[PDB]
């Protein structure tokens, strides 16, 4: 009809989704109300301005921001001086999602830079001369795979990488993040991601890892950083994704996991929160929503007959509305929520989450939902690795040609 | 800002 | 000595006592990518850090240099590693180092390195006496700090400091009954002490939770806890639960209450309850109300639940095709 609002967040009934604090005010409700009031303003802006809403992904602005950042950054990034391979990954992936080609001048310089970050003993550090750490190692491998050239693949010293992973492995199945470092579920994922992509998984490398990850699932249904800790989207993504790689998703109670992640989508804002009773944040558009494709693939493998054949188990439309309307910086780049400043991390994860929300794929079955202008459509992302499905296939195929170190 | 490492 | 923010702070390249060392610039290559345009102070400290690290100089001056490198970027795990090497080689007083890490954590509480460093100190000293109070102070500024709660669980578990934690949990729940981190801690304490099998304990817990639900019907955490502590034994194992939830339907409804009812029906159907059909319909009816009216953000999940319950609990479900 004519009175019909096609944007879910602008429908009159949507106002019913506002927080009900039961007249019991606590820090949690107060903070939540503040965000909802700010988000409501964004939603009502077109109406107060008397303009018809048009959801446009500011591609050219995002491209300029990324293109320059891949080369040079301000001192605002001093706090990420130990995360340079992440800056490479976040930027290259955002460009890949936006379907912007990677010039070979750029590709070769990234390769050479990541080589400088590679440790003589395996793994990659946060910058040249820094000790190897599993997080920048995961980021470096992903970045080299996004490039996907023989030169890129050849940068990875597979023998030393495997040695590095073994030096971090613990008797309980977990891994340290780096020598003398902390332990949490991120390490299991970083290790499984790089080891699977490079084909260096020996028969015992991940002995007990699936069990350790399974111990992280708590009473909430989600997964915490270490056994006993509160369920958290980033760690849950790390746990499930790692288990999917190890082909042990079944160690988890997938039912409670699914109920927990779906409950993390915010009824009013449309985006996802990282933990129950916390605020919405654009990066969780990936960590949380990315779980749905994983759960769909797992449940389906168990012959689940009730699974939809066209949608993920989350409000794809509402997530897209949240990102497009509330997470774009006018000058380029994406963010956490209105009032927050842009950064490459949020640019990478908001776009990743947007791609997940736009594309449903389950074998022969394929169904897209592109909110706003059709030019808004991004390139698909692999739900386990968060790099193009084609890069994943290409990389794995290439490394399967080499033999697992030692044989 | 969000810190992942 | 000379703080990084001191008005009279001087760059290392202008310090006489460092004249013998040649700073080592960062090896970014011929044509850098993601090159950070560091400020003068940052690059200067790090060029000197690269020098001491490269020659593995385990000196008092190197020790003080790491404090500056850390203040410039507390996330530099390589600097923290070298600092720990120096703490051991130079036999530095660890309680003095504890005073230092408590100040740094107060400044940058959402950083991985600082909490890991504090853990290492506690382990080295085998002394958890300042932990609970230190953590309580951080939690007093951010009651949901993940690193703080994680460190707290480790201290409590490793040193067996369970005695007063439930009292602490109750205090924080008073301050903010919506704090999911506290509900998680409550579960943490009880699981590792009495456990939830003790019927007197489980009952106390459910009573408490229903009481909190009545006070704040829309607080999702209480609902998740209630479900979390009963779901393992099976929701149908508690016949009075259903009746009682239905009694809140009028004056205390929420999509949470409705969702829970579906959880109970679902388990009842899983454990061959009486009136298989009457229950199933009540369930599909609630799923529809949720997907179309009371909880549309989760319409895909609710439609899936309704479809699953249908798929295996309808009177036709066990009936062969030919019939
Ligand atoms: C505000 C958002 C934050 C702090 C993101 C939390 C996410 C994680 C922790 C997941 C990290 C995953 C890897 C390092 C692979
Ligand atoms: Zn974020």
XYZ file of C-alpha atoms and ligand atoms in Angstrom:
751
model
C 0.000 0.000 0.000
C 0.914 3.727 -0.086
C 0.941 4.220 3.706
C 3.255 1.151 3.965
C 6.806 1.818 5.204
C 9.312 -0.610 3.559
C 12.001 0.175 6.169
C 11.451 -1.994 9.261
C 13.034 0.534 11.656
C 10.726 3.328 10.491
C 7.407 1.439 10.757
C 5.007 2.877 13.373
C 4.966 -0.417 15.312
C 8.734 -0.300 15.594
C 8.265 2.227 18.405
C 6.867 -0.647 20.475
C 10.395 -2.111 20.498
C 11.697 0.630 22.829
C 13.131 -0.413 26.184
C 10.716 -1.044 29.064
C 12.667 -0.393 32.262
C 9.806 -1.425 34.591
C 10.434 1.884 36.348
C 13.516 0.307 37.909
C 16.443 2.366 36.708
C 19.942 0.875 36.766
C 23.157 1.830 34.948
C 22.353 -0.789 32.306
C 18.877 0.574 31.454
C 20.015 4.211 31.604
C 22.817 3.535 29.124
C 20.554 1.488 26.884
C 17.915 4.274 26.830
C 20.544 6.850 25.811
C 21.559 4.751 22.800
C 17.939 4.149 21.795
C 17.159 7.836 21.937
C 20.168 8.619 19.731
C 19.243 5.806 17.298
C 15.613 6.953 17.208
C 16.832 10.411 16.083
C 18.692 8.803 13.162
C 15.582 6.797 12.219
C 13.222 9.844 12.442
C 15.666 12.211 10.655
C 14.136 11.728 7.175
C 10.660 12.360 8.630
C 11.667 15.530 10.527
C 13.483 16.749 7.400
C 10.602 15.803 5.065
C 12.690 13.674 2.729
C 12.188 10.131 1.477
C 14.835 7.797 3.019
C 17.449 6.365 0.704
C 19.932 3.840 2.131
C 23.189 4.304 0.305
C 26.435 2.537 1.160
C 28.945 5.385 0.659
C 31.362 3.250 -1.436
C 33.518 6.012 -2.915
C 34.019 7.575 0.528
C 34.915 4.185 2.098
C 37.288 3.381 -0.759
C 39.214 6.637 -0.427
C 39.544 6.089 3.347
C 40.827 2.522 2.896
C 43.042 3.219 -0.126
C 45.015 5.865 1.819
C 45.045 3.989 5.119
C 46.638 0.989 3.390
C 49.607 3.232 2.759
C 49.853 5.687 5.590
C 48.171 6.282 8.949
C 48.151 9.154 11.452
C 49.560 8.890 14.968
C 46.011 8.018 15.997
C 47.145 4.504 15.128
C 50.082 4.461 17.554
C 47.927 2.226 19.809
C 47.914 -0.308 16.958
C 51.659 -0.276 16.351
C 51.689 -3.927 17.515
C 48.825 -4.836 15.138
C 50.086 -3.847 11.718
C 49.157 -7.138 10.048
C 45.621 -6.509 11.364
C 45.641 -3.105 9.684
C 46.651 -4.876 6.467
C 43.930 -7.491 6.848
C 41.122 -5.131 7.896
C 41.836 -2.821 4.955
C 42.432 -5.454 2.253
C 39.296 -7.322 3.344
C 37.151 -4.167 3.319
C 38.441 -3.408 -0.189
C 37.745 -6.999 -1.241
C 34.157 -6.747 0.081
C 33.726 -3.467 -1.815
C 35.038 -5.232 -4.918
C 38.016 -2.895 -5.328
C 40.991 -4.541 -7.065
C 44.351 -4.788 -5.328
C 47.052 -3.302 -7.609
C 50.138 -5.507 -7.914
C 52.321 -2.615 -6.675
C 50.242 -2.726 -3.482
C 50.113 -6.524 -3.323
C 53.891 -6.913 -3.584
C 54.550 -4.236 -0.929
C 52.106 -5.908 1.495
C 53.876 -9.223 0.894
C 57.280 -7.710 1.561
C 56.007 -5.933 4.646
C 54.466 -9.108 6.096
C 57.759 -10.888 5.429
C 59.462 -8.281 7.602
C 56.896 -9.089 10.311
C 57.519 -12.838 10.062
C 59.569 -14.275 12.897
C 62.721 -16.386 12.290
C 60.995 -18.994 14.465
C 57.562 -18.947 12.840
C 54.463 -16.831 13.057
C 54.097 -13.115 12.460
C 54.566 -10.267 14.898
C 52.722 -6.959 15.149
C 55.439 -5.220 13.207
C 59.069 -5.744 12.089
C 61.205 -6.979 14.957
C 58.258 -7.765 17.215
C 57.812 -11.249 18.669
C 55.356 -13.544 16.857
C 51.793 -13.593 18.244
C 48.779 -15.667 17.094
C 46.524 -12.681 16.429
C 48.814 -10.880 13.925
C 49.702 -14.361 12.537
C 46.004 -14.978 11.794
C 45.672 -11.518 10.255
C 48.849 -11.858 8.187
C 47.834 -15.233 6.724
C 44.355 -13.886 5.890
C 45.836 -10.807 4.210
C 48.287 -12.905 2.134
C 45.367 -15.169 1.082
C 43.190 -12.201 0.078
C 46.060 -11.219 -2.219
C 46.289 -14.840 -3.289
C 49.324 -14.677 -5.552
C 52.152 -17.243 -5.652
C 54.307 -14.485 -4.155
C 51.805 -13.971 -1.322
C 51.479 -17.677 -0.510
C 55.273 -18.097 -0.669
C 55.815 -15.593 2.151
C 54.529 -18.064 4.739
C 57.250 -20.277 6.182
C 55.059 -23.337 6.778
C 57.629 -25.418 8.707
C 58.440 -22.698 11.212
C 54.734 -21.787 11.429
C 53.908 -25.358 12.533
C 56.801 -25.311 15.004
C 55.459 -22.006 16.334
C 51.966 -23.465 16.853
C 53.424 -26.436 18.748
C 55.451 -24.168 20.994
C 52.186 -22.508 22.105
C 50.103 -25.674 22.621
C 49.081 -26.528 26.198
C 48.398 -29.896 27.890
C 44.735 -28.954 28.378
C 44.196 -28.473 24.637
C 44.438 -24.675 24.615
C 47.148 -22.453 23.132
C 48.980 -19.389 24.445
C 48.559 -16.267 22.280
C 52.347 -15.900 22.201
C 55.356 -17.044 24.282
C 54.782 -15.955 27.871
C 51.304 -14.767 26.851
C 47.675 -15.237 27.835
C 45.284 -18.048 26.951
C 41.708 -17.675 25.705
C 39.582 -19.001 22.858
C 41.053 -16.553 20.336
C 44.206 -18.674 20.178
C 42.381 -21.880 19.211
C 40.687 -20.057 16.332
C 43.818 -18.193 15.173
C 45.739 -21.498 15.219
C 43.066 -23.572 13.443
C 42.525 -20.815 10.836
C 46.165 -20.518 9.755
C 46.950 -24.245 10.125
C 43.960 -25.289 8.033
C 44.571 -22.705 5.313
C 48.265 -23.588 4.986
C 47.722 -27.366 5.288
C 50.023 -27.918 8.295
C 47.570 -29.770 10.536
C 49.364 -32.857 11.880
C 47.354 -35.664 13.589
C 47.936 -34.415 17.176
C 48.292 -30.609 16.808
C 44.734 -29.994 18.008
C 44.552 -32.860 20.483
C 42.105 -31.879 23.186
C 41.442 -28.482 21.598
C 37.815 -29.225 20.732
C 37.179 -30.350 24.301
C 38.778 -27.262 25.744
C 36.660 -25.047 23.454
C 33.556 -27.015 24.488
C 34.316 -26.213 28.165
C 34.013 -22.500 27.288
C 30.309 -22.862 26.451
C 28.418 -21.766 29.585
C 24.918 -21.739 31.081
C 23.887 -18.942 28.673
C 24.380 -21.029 25.562
C 27.175 -18.825 24.255
C 30.947 -19.193 24.651
C 33.254 -17.261 27.006
C 36.970 -16.539 26.618
C 37.998 -19.306 29.031
C 35.928 -21.912 30.989
C 33.638 -20.186 33.483
C 33.527 -16.784 31.773
C 30.451 -14.879 30.540
C 29.149 -15.683 27.035
C 30.636 -13.231 24.523
C 30.145 -12.774 20.785
C 33.791 -12.439 19.781
C 34.842 -15.501 21.749
C 31.743 -17.423 20.636
C 32.610 -16.741 17.030
C 36.190 -17.888 17.720
C 34.970 -21.071 19.429
C 32.387 -22.150 16.886
C 34.522 -21.209 13.882
C 37.466 -23.180 15.318
C 35.193 -26.184 16.010
C 33.813 -25.969 12.465
C 37.388 -26.087 11.144
C 38.168 -29.084 13.385
C 34.857 -30.679 12.344
C 33.693 -30.940 15.959
C 30.821 -28.434 16.157
C 28.795 -31.256 17.627
C 30.815 -31.113 20.887
C 28.646 -28.063 21.641
C 24.993 -27.810 22.580
C 24.146 -26.070 19.298
C 20.554 -25.550 20.392
C 21.403 -23.324 23.367
C 24.098 -21.637 21.264
C 21.545 -20.781 18.569
C 19.063 -19.465 21.117
C 21.743 -17.293 22.683
C 23.100 -15.683 19.505
C 19.622 -14.943 18.106
C 18.784 -13.209 21.414
C 21.806 -10.922 20.884
C 20.122 -8.989 18.070
C 18.643 -5.769 19.487
C 14.880 -5.419 18.913
C 14.977 -1.638 18.559
C 18.412 -0.872 17.053
C 18.504 -3.927 14.782
C 22.242 -4.448 15.280
C 23.874 -6.938 17.680
C 25.211 -6.607 21.228
C 28.315 -8.501 22.374
C 26.842 -9.745 25.649
C 23.356 -9.876 27.174
C 22.412 -6.521 28.724
C 25.180 -4.563 26.965
C 24.982 -1.999 24.121
C 24.662 -2.551 20.391
C 27.910 -2.265 18.398
C 28.496 -2.513 14.666
C 31.503 -4.883 14.820
C 29.239 -7.531 16.340
C 27.324 -7.426 13.075
C 30.047 -9.878 12.180
C 31.083 -11.716 15.336
C 27.439 -12.443 16.235
C 25.581 -12.625 12.914
C 28.487 -14.606 11.443
C 27.500 -17.449 13.775
C 24.210 -17.985 11.942
C 25.772 -19.235 8.713
C 27.974 -21.523 10.852
C 25.000 -22.868 12.806
C 23.028 -23.303 9.606
C 25.849 -25.352 8.088
C 26.184 -27.438 11.280
C 22.479 -28.055 11.865
C 22.017 -28.932 8.210
C 24.874 -31.452 8.404
C 22.808 -33.149 11.120
C 19.943 -33.425 8.633
C 17.859 -30.708 10.293
C 14.687 -30.549 8.121
C 13.208 -27.336 9.555
C 16.041 -25.082 8.298
C 15.003 -22.203 6.007
C 16.303 -22.352 2.461
C 16.437 -18.607 1.887
C 17.355 -16.824 5.155
C 19.783 -17.001 8.093
C 18.220 -17.184 11.532
C 18.393 -13.450 12.179
C 16.633 -10.308 10.950
C 18.841 -9.703 7.893
C 16.868 -6.614 6.904
C 17.128 -4.969 10.361
C 20.878 -5.598 10.631
C 21.390 -3.953 7.198
C 19.237 -1.016 8.236
C 21.265 -0.537 11.404
C 24.592 -0.597 9.561
C 23.598 1.556 6.587
C 21.692 4.140 8.642
C 23.728 4.262 11.874
C 27.246 3.026 11.223
C 28.587 5.005 8.309
C 30.926 7.929 8.768
C 30.037 10.668 6.187
C 33.762 11.154 5.456
C 34.226 7.418 4.791
C 34.744 4.462 7.126
C 32.303 2.673 9.432
C 31.717 2.629 13.139
C 30.453 1.146 16.386
C 27.354 3.346 16.751
C 26.302 7.012 16.255
C 28.607 9.296 18.212
C 31.617 6.983 17.906
C 34.523 7.654 15.566
C 35.447 5.510 12.574
C 38.379 3.086 12.532
C 39.518 0.320 10.217
C 38.456 -2.427 12.613
C 34.806 -1.318 12.554
C 35.049 -0.621 8.841
C 36.129 -4.237 8.301
C 33.547 -5.844 10.588
C 30.542 -3.673 9.767
C 31.077 -4.435 6.066
C 31.663 -8.137 6.822
C 28.407 -8.232 8.792
C 26.612 -6.385 5.989
C 27.775 -9.002 3.457
C 26.604 -11.836 5.725
C 23.174 -10.134 6.007
C 22.863 -9.650 2.231
C 23.814 -13.168 1.162
C 22.232 -16.493 2.026
C 23.882 -19.572 0.555
C 23.371 -23.280 1.327
C 24.639 -25.397 -1.561
C 22.514 -24.951 -4.707
C 20.132 -22.658 -2.778
C 21.030 -18.942 -2.980
C 19.048 -15.903 -1.844
C 20.077 -12.249 -1.521
C 18.432 -9.366 0.329
C 19.949 -5.998 -0.629
C 18.419 -3.132 1.356
C 18.591 0.341 -0.190
C 20.101 0.996 -3.616
C 21.158 -2.187 -5.495
C 24.745 -0.838 -5.705
C 24.891 -1.552 -1.950
C 25.596 -5.244 -2.648
C 29.005 -6.429 -1.418
C 31.115 -9.437 -2.323
C 30.357 -12.554 -0.178
C 32.568 -13.498 2.779
C 33.449 -16.984 4.053
C 31.788 -17.360 7.522
C 34.740 -19.253 9.033
C 37.713 -17.220 7.746
C 36.098 -13.886 6.891
C 37.864 -13.609 3.535
C 36.276 -14.236 0.117
C 35.074 -17.877 -0.342
C 37.108 -17.896 -3.535
C 40.294 -16.908 -1.685
C 39.689 -19.685 0.825
C 39.264 -22.301 -1.915
C 42.177 -20.937 -3.890
C 44.523 -20.900 -0.890
C 43.552 -24.341 0.473
C 43.906 -25.884 -3.005
C 47.337 -24.348 -3.409
C 48.630 -25.524 -0.042
C 47.228 -29.014 -0.450
C 49.931 -29.397 -3.125
C 52.617 -29.152 -0.473
C 52.997 -31.915 2.097
C 52.229 -31.329 5.820
C 55.637 -30.371 7.345
C 57.614 -33.487 8.251
C 55.201 -35.441 6.010
C 37.685 1.724 20.936
C 37.387 -2.074 20.794
C 40.611 -4.007 21.456
C 40.981 -7.582 20.117
C 44.627 -8.251 21.087
C 62.224 9.266 37.385
C 61.216 11.315 34.313
C 57.573 10.740 33.451
C 56.502 10.637 29.827
C 54.132 13.536 30.581
C 56.576 15.595 32.624
C 56.814 19.223 31.370
C 60.612 18.735 31.395
C 60.603 15.349 29.645
C 63.541 15.083 27.229
C 63.848 12.798 24.189
C 66.239 9.870 24.629
C 68.429 11.128 21.763
C 69.092 14.213 23.923
C 70.004 12.275 27.091
C 73.747 12.140 27.889
C 73.432 8.819 29.757
C 72.234 7.216 26.497
C 74.971 8.678 24.260
C 76.753 5.336 23.821
C 73.745 3.643 22.192
C 72.798 4.022 18.544
C 69.019 3.990 18.285
C 67.728 1.358 15.860
C 65.104 2.719 13.461
C 62.131 0.601 12.457
C 62.725 -1.722 9.525
C 59.603 -0.925 7.456
C 61.172 -1.630 4.083
C 61.654 0.357 0.812
C 57.947 1.194 0.359
C 55.898 0.800 3.574
C 52.245 -0.177 3.855
C 50.069 0.804 6.862
C 52.925 3.077 7.849
C 52.127 4.970 11.012
C 53.364 8.570 11.168
C 54.509 8.388 14.781
C 54.970 11.457 16.901
C 58.534 12.462 17.816
C 58.276 11.091 21.347
C 56.918 7.732 20.202
C 59.502 7.083 17.499
C 62.337 8.218 19.765
C 61.447 5.872 22.639
C 60.868 2.969 20.273
C 64.108 3.486 18.348
C 65.899 3.199 21.699
C 63.803 0.215 22.734
C 64.758 -1.519 19.470
C 68.391 -0.851 20.346
C 68.290 -2.308 23.864
C 66.165 -5.262 22.704
C 68.492 -5.998 19.813
C 71.557 -6.092 22.020
C 69.626 -7.747 24.854
C 70.857 -5.107 27.296
C 69.510 -6.137 30.685
C 70.105 -2.881 32.515
C 68.364 -0.572 34.906
C 68.186 2.079 32.185
C 66.596 -0.448 29.814
C 64.095 -1.260 32.563
C 63.044 2.365 32.946
C 62.861 2.704 29.147
C 60.201 -0.047 28.959
C 57.973 1.956 31.324
C 57.982 4.728 28.717
C 57.510 2.363 25.790
C 54.527 0.882 27.628
C 52.999 4.241 28.360
C 53.265 5.133 24.667
C 51.588 1.847 23.661
C 50.529 -0.456 26.506
C 49.454 -3.022 23.890
C 53.014 -3.710 22.790
C 53.334 -7.299 24.010
C 57.008 -7.452 22.924
C 57.840 -4.631 25.373
C 55.973 -6.425 28.181
C 57.935 -9.608 27.466
C 61.266 -7.782 27.650
C 60.130 -6.060 30.835
C 59.443 -9.422 32.466
C 62.887 -10.628 31.367
C 64.381 -7.542 33.080
C 62.310 -8.017 36.264
C 63.916 -11.446 36.695
C 67.502 -10.656 35.550
C 67.723 -7.479 37.617
C 65.959 -9.059 40.611
C 63.492 -6.175 40.809
C 61.218 -5.950 43.841
C 57.925 -7.518 42.654
C 55.648 -5.675 45.111
C 56.961 -2.440 43.688
C 56.079 -3.875 40.261
C 52.614 -4.760 41.613
C 52.170 -1.085 42.579
C 53.127 -0.206 39.046
C 50.757 -2.630 37.302
C 47.832 -1.567 39.484
C 48.338 2.038 38.322
C 48.652 1.020 34.659
C 45.518 -1.150 34.794
C 43.591 1.703 36.453
C 44.594 3.804 33.403
C 44.008 1.188 30.646
C 41.669 -1.479 32.074
C 40.570 -2.999 28.730
C 44.020 -4.158 27.651
C 45.151 -7.792 27.447
C 48.806 -7.304 28.333
C 48.294 -5.469 31.608
C 46.045 -8.135 33.082
C 48.312 -10.945 31.950
C 51.279 -9.149 33.483
C 49.473 -8.787 36.822
C 48.633 -12.518 36.728
C 52.279 -13.409 36.186
C 53.227 -11.182 39.162
C 50.648 -12.873 41.415
C 51.925 -16.276 40.286
C 55.568 -15.320 40.908
C 54.748 -13.936 44.370
C 52.197 -16.685 45.157
C 50.254 -13.867 46.806
C 46.584 -13.087 45.999
C 46.001 -10.847 48.996
C 45.515 -7.622 47.037
C 43.468 -9.140 44.201
C 39.837 -9.150 45.195
C 40.032 -5.587 46.464
C 41.995 -4.348 43.471
C 39.518 -5.975 41.065
C 36.575 -4.654 43.086
C 37.968 -1.167 42.533
C 38.156 -1.659 38.752
C 34.655 -3.205 38.752
C 33.496 -0.170 40.649
C 34.366 1.969 37.591
C 33.164 -0.573 34.989
C 31.045 -3.342 36.516
C 31.207 -5.315 33.278
C 34.953 -5.246 32.541
C 35.550 -8.661 30.963
C 39.275 -8.831 31.813
C 38.527 -7.899 35.414
C 35.898 -10.642 35.837
C 38.192 -13.174 34.114
C 41.149 -12.358 36.352
C 38.804 -12.516 39.370
C 37.623 -16.019 38.464
C 41.228 -17.138 38.068
C 42.325 -15.732 41.428
C 39.328 -17.187 43.264
C 39.685 -20.598 41.678
C 43.470 -20.969 41.901
C 43.743 -19.710 45.478
C 40.358 -21.064 46.586
C 38.987 -17.664 47.686
C 35.312 -18.679 47.487
C 34.174 -17.644 50.974
C 32.888 -14.142 50.295
C 32.145 -14.090 46.587
C 28.412 -14.771 46.805
C 28.128 -11.860 49.208
C 30.002 -9.764 46.613
C 27.663 -10.978 43.847
C 24.599 -10.054 45.934
C 26.024 -6.595 46.504
C 26.552 -5.981 42.781
C 23.141 -7.423 41.887
C 21.661 -4.857 44.322
C 23.531 -2.084 42.530
C 22.440 -3.327 39.076
C 20.260 -6.437 38.789
C 20.716 -6.155 35.008
C 24.492 -6.788 35.192
C 24.905 -10.041 33.238
C 28.529 -10.329 34.345
C 27.326 -10.650 37.964
C 24.747 -13.282 37.026
C 27.556 -15.186 35.337
C 29.701 -14.829 38.489
C 26.792 -16.028 40.634
C 26.645 -19.168 38.527
C 30.431 -19.458 38.766
C 30.462 -19.362 42.577
C 27.560 -21.777 43.083
C 28.791 -24.332 40.534
C 32.200 -24.590 42.169
C 30.997 -24.614 45.745
C 27.663 -26.309 46.566
C 26.735 -27.110 43.005
C 23.123 -26.924 41.765
C 22.172 -30.555 42.531
C 21.583 -29.800 46.189
C 17.803 -29.344 46.106
C 17.821 -26.779 48.907
C 20.284 -24.653 46.871
C 18.513 -24.994 43.500
C 15.209 -23.990 45.116
C 16.775 -20.971 46.823
C 18.125 -19.947 43.431
C 14.888 -20.325 41.519
C 13.014 -18.502 44.287
C 15.497 -15.649 44.151
C 15.366 -15.446 40.346
C 11.546 -15.484 40.157
C 11.592 -12.754 42.767
C 13.975 -10.644 40.633
C 11.840 -11.344 37.555
C 8.740 -10.078 39.399
C 10.570 -6.865 40.326
C 11.971 -6.277 36.803
C 9.895 -8.407 34.339
C 11.930 -7.203 31.356
C 15.413 -7.916 32.681
C 16.676 -10.584 30.260
C 19.503 -11.732 32.558
C 17.250 -13.155 35.301
C 15.336 -15.052 32.644
C 18.514 -16.490 31.149
C 19.780 -17.528 34.568
C 16.502 -19.234 35.522
C 16.608 -21.164 32.270
C 20.335 -21.809 32.598
C 20.070 -23.489 35.997
C 17.055 -25.684 35.085
C 17.608 -26.553 31.420
C 20.228 -29.192 32.119
C 18.034 -31.445 34.276
C 15.158 -30.708 31.886
C 12.440 -28.042 32.107
C 9.658 -30.663 32.180
C 11.232 -32.181 35.315
C 9.639 -29.230 37.173
C 5.809 -29.403 36.748
C 5.082 -26.355 38.967
C 7.297 -24.050 36.930
C 4.820 -23.854 34.030
C 1.803 -23.100 36.222
C 3.775 -20.410 38.025
C 4.968 -18.726 34.822
C 1.410 -18.629 33.486
C 0.521 -16.813 36.727
C 2.767 -13.922 35.742
C 1.247 -13.730 32.216
C -1.167 -10.915 33.117
C 0.665 -8.440 35.380
C 4.249 -9.427 34.350
C 4.308 -10.514 30.677
C 7.263 -10.058 28.279
C 8.533 -11.818 25.156
C 10.929 -13.512 27.618
C 8.070 -15.108 29.581
C 6.441 -16.251 26.306
C 9.724 -17.641 24.979
C 10.243 -19.594 28.213
C 6.765 -21.175 27.947
C 7.781 -22.424 24.522
C 10.958 -23.838 26.082
C 8.903 -25.749 28.664
C 6.401 -27.060 26.073
C 9.285 -28.088 23.827
C 10.884 -30.197 26.583
C 7.516 -31.640 27.661
C 6.987 -32.786 24.076
C 10.538 -34.198 24.087
C 9.703 -36.294 27.171
C 6.323 -37.695 25.991
C 4.023 -35.594 28.161
C 0.266 -36.156 28.383
C -1.886 -34.419 25.735
C 0.949 -34.374 23.180
C -1.278 -32.392 20.821
C -2.829 -29.877 23.205
C 0.731 -28.843 24.217
C 2.092 -28.685 20.686
C -0.691 -26.285 19.628
C -0.154 -24.066 22.652
C 3.516 -23.942 21.524
C 2.973 -23.180 17.823
C 0.491 -20.493 18.913
C 3.153 -18.825 21.084
C 5.797 -19.164 18.364
C 3.468 -17.365 15.963
C 2.636 -14.616 18.445
C 6.396 -14.126 18.893
C 7.375 -14.181 15.177
C 4.518 -11.907 14.120
C 3.808 -9.706 17.103
C 5.770 -9.900 20.373
C 9.311 -10.682 19.122
C 9.599 -10.029 15.374
C 13.350 -9.316 15.402
C 13.629 -13.092 15.947
C 10.880 -14.070 13.460
C 13.263 -16.382 11.585
C 14.217 -18.187 14.772
C 10.625 -18.487 15.968
C 9.367 -19.702 12.582
C 12.163 -22.319 12.736
C 11.176 -23.456 16.254
C 7.525 -23.705 15.205
C 8.628 -25.678 12.154
C 10.785 -28.055 14.272
C 8.086 -28.710 16.871
C 5.698 -29.383 13.993
C 8.231 -31.615 12.235
C 8.489 -34.033 15.151
C 5.561 -33.637 17.548
C 2.399 -33.400 15.395
C 0.073 -36.440 15.587
C 1.173 -37.208 12.003
C 4.897 -37.165 12.885
C 5.202 -40.873 13.795
C 2.543 -41.939 11.241
C 3.858 -43.766 8.102
C 3.300 -42.158 4.676
C 0.792 -44.860 3.539
C -1.722 -44.224 6.361
C 34.055 -3.627 21.182
C 34.379 -4.889 20.464
C 35.282 -5.784 20.876
C 36.099 -5.625 22.141
C 35.548 -7.036 20.081
C 35.548 -8.365 20.830
C 35.904 -9.450 19.870
C 36.801 -10.397 20.099
C 37.592 -10.503 21.383
C 37.100 -11.448 19.079
C 38.567 -11.453 18.684
C 38.880 -12.416 17.595
C 40.129 -12.610 17.137
C 41.336 -11.882 17.667
C 40.432 -13.589 16.039
Zn 32.908 -2.648 18.151
